[PDB]
Amino acid sequence: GTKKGVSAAAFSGVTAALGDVGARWFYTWAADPQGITAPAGTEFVPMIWGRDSVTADQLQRAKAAGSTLLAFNEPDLAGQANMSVETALDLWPQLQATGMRLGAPAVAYGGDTPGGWLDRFMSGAAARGYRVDFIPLHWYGGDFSAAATGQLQSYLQAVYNRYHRPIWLTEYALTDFSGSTPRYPSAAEQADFVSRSTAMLNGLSFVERYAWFSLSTSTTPTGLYTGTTPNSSGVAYRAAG
Ligand code: NA
Numbered sequence: 001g002t003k004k005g006v007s008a009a010a011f012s013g014v015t016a017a018l019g020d021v022g023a024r025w026f027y028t029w030a031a032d033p034q035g036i037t038a039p040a041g042t043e044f045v046p047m048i049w050g051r052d053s054v055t056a057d058q059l060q061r062a063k064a065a066g067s068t069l070l071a072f073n074e075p076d077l078a079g080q081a082n083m084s085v086e087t088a089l090d091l092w093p094q095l096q097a098t099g100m101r102l103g104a105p106a107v108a109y110g111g112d113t114p115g116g117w118l119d120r121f122m123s124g125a126a127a128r129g130y131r132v133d134f135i136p137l138h139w140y141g142g143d144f145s146a147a148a149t150g151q152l153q154s155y156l157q158a159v160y161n162r163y164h165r166p167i168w169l170t171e172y173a174l175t176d177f178s179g180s181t182p183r184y185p186s187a188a189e190q191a192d193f194v195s196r197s198t199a200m201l202n203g204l205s206f207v208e209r210y211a212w213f214s215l216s217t218s219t220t221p222t223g224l225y226t227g228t229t230p231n232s233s234g235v236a237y238r239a240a241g
Helices: 014-021 056-065 085-096 117-128 148-163 187-202 232-239
Strands: 004-007 025-027 068-070 101-103 135-141 167-174 207-212
Touching (some): 014 232, 025 207, 085 117, 135 148, 148 187, 167 187, 187 232
Parallel strands (some): 004 207, 068 101, 167 207
16 A cells, blocks of 8 residues: 555654554654654655745755645644644745645644634635645544544545545544543554554545554654554554555
């Protein structure tokens, strides 16, 4: 398959972990690999994370580093890119002018909601004659049962049905963020979800790429690897197509 990728940072053993897990692509939330040496066959995808990365220098660096460009990360959240739709649209021509295959900003929430951030962005892009080649999404499930895969699927399908752009899933895991501090599944629940979700994602033609959040436990408790050693979730992700 071409779909399976990961987000990553340059922790000790990252090059080995990327190859071990079989990542076809990766990204780093930045315009370059952030110190990661990718294994052969693992494609880096640059990102323009927020307003401060919309510079001629960053855009040229991104275009030198890869072929596909991801736009702003969670502009809908104050603790992430924290950007209005208007600001994102006004910056958009600079990203579009790279000529790269271009992903929408990845909203944290509400991608299928009429009048939400993504909907207003896509509507304004269409009105302005802008190009948006694909839509990357984020999804963190708070229901840790076998039902989680179908919940994720329904969100992806809703966003595809609304805008008819191919979908990337650039962050996903089981994590309940409803509370003052994140709540996580058991290791077994997580590994089962990795298996079921990747099988689902591999069968949806409109999902081009997906990336578990994240490769390393140094990034998040939902990490797949500690150093070069996969946990049961990393083993399940490695086994996925
Ligand atoms: Na390029």
